[PDB]
Amino acid sequence: NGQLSIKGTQLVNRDGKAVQLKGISSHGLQWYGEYVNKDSLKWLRDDWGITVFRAAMYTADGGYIDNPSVKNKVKEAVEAAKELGIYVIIDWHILNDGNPNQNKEKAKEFFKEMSSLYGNTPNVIYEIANEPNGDVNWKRDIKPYAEEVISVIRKNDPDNIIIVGTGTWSQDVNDAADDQLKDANVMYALHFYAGTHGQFLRDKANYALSKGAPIFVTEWGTSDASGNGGVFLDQSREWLKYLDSKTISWVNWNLSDKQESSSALKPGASKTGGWRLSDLSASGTFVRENILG
């Protein structure tokens, strides 16, 4: 494992071999941070074979902007990841606050603090803006934000991977690819839902890679885009086959018992892991099967 770096569009480990990370994301830490602890992460490492865990620290909706103490759960997750030898994504999970400039001063302060703490920790990956959305585009809105935040992180952490979200809920990776950041260790987020997104979205990804823009799927669901609507296993297989075909790392949404199809767990499932297959939802079962391979 160790230090990650990027060879062209390909994430590699410190040995210089290609690596395709696979894992699962928390739901918002202000609501479901109870599922995020050294016990549950260890169980995911050991039972599911995860090699990456995403700590989805919402900014809006009772998240870090209104109550910053949720940052202690991010640090808990990072310390768990270090002890367990897995990667951890620190995800500044914008959504209702769809332009990343809305909370930019607080993001910069947050990332200054995290890079300062974890700037020598190879476990950590920064995801600086989960899903830009609304009338928010790369050149005008998302790129200038990413430059300022990357500049902060790089003062403390010169080499860890930074993943930058793209327009239309991290769909418009082609627009990023036409105006790339210069940072040597940047990747662009692509998010999809198996019940909603299809070939048009793969073609955008293909276009971005052909331009040298690396892609990492920090969030995808087996559901349609609402997160409910049942599970689309055929489409999900087709998407994972496509990601495999390009060695694209991915992180499923989401580890929680929220009552909707994209949640991996059924209500009542332990907060500290050790789940029977009857504790897993249809999504959770599929996702776990695919991480194990």
Whichever of 12 and 282 has its CB closer to Mn ion, that residue is 12
The residues, any chain, with a CB within 8 Å of residue 21's CB and separated by 6 or more, are 11, 51, 52, 87, 216, 249, 250, 251
Whichever of 125 and 269 has its CB closer to Mn ion, that residue is 125
- What is the closest distance, in whole angstroms, from the C-beta atom of residue 259 to Mn ion in the complex? 39
Among 157, 172, 175, 257, binds Mn ion (CB under 5 A): 157
Set 127, 131, 238, 289: catalytic member: 131
Among 109, 159, 178, 179, binds Mn ion (CB under 5 A): 159
What are the distances in angstroms from CA 161 to CA 44, 179, 200, 259? 22, 19, 27, 33
Q: Is residue 131 annotated as part of the catalytic site, yes or no?
A: yes
Which of the ranges 36-44, 127-135, 157-165, 204-212 carries the binding residues for Mn ion, by CB under 5 A? 157-165
Residue 253 is labelled as binding a ligand: yes
Q: Is residue 109 annotated as part of the catalytic site, yes or no?
A: no
Set 79, 83, 148, 219: catalytic member: 219
Residue 32 is labelled as binding a ligand: yes
- What is the closest distance, in whole angstroms, from the C-beta atom of residue 71 to Mn ion in the complex? 19
Residue 246 is labelled as binding a ligand: no
Residue 78 touching Mn ion (CB under 5 A): no
Which residues are 251's β-sheet partners?
Answer: 23
Residue 249 touching Mn ion (CB under 5 A): no
* Count of chain residues binding Mn ion (CB under 5 A): 3
- What is the closest distance, in whole angstroms, from the C-beta atom of residue 93 to Mn ion in the complex? 22
What are the distances in angstroms from CA 176 to CA 46, 205, 249? 36, 11, 18
- Cα separation of 276 and 130, whole Å? 31
For residues 170 and 219, the answer to whether their CB atoms sit within 8 Å is: yes
Structure tokens at 28: 């918002």
- What is the closest distance, in whole angstroms, from the C-beta atom of residue 156 to Mn ion in the complex? 8
Task: Provide φ and ψ at 234, rounded to 5°.
Answer: -65, -50
Which residues are 24's β-sheet partners?
Answer: 53, 252
Which of the ranges 55-63, 149-157, 164-172, 218-226 carries the binding residues for Mn ion, by CB under 5 A? 149-157
Residue 259 is labelled as binding a ligand: yes
Closest residue to Mn ion, based on beta-carbon distance? 160
- What is the closest distance, in whole angstroms, from the C-beta atom of residue 52 to Mn ion in the complex? 16
Residue 160 touching Mn ion (CB under 5 A): yes
Binding site for Mn ion (CB under 5 A): 157, 159-160
The residues carrying an active-site annotation are 131, 219
State the binding site.
27, 31-32, 58, 93, 193, 225-226, 253, 258-260
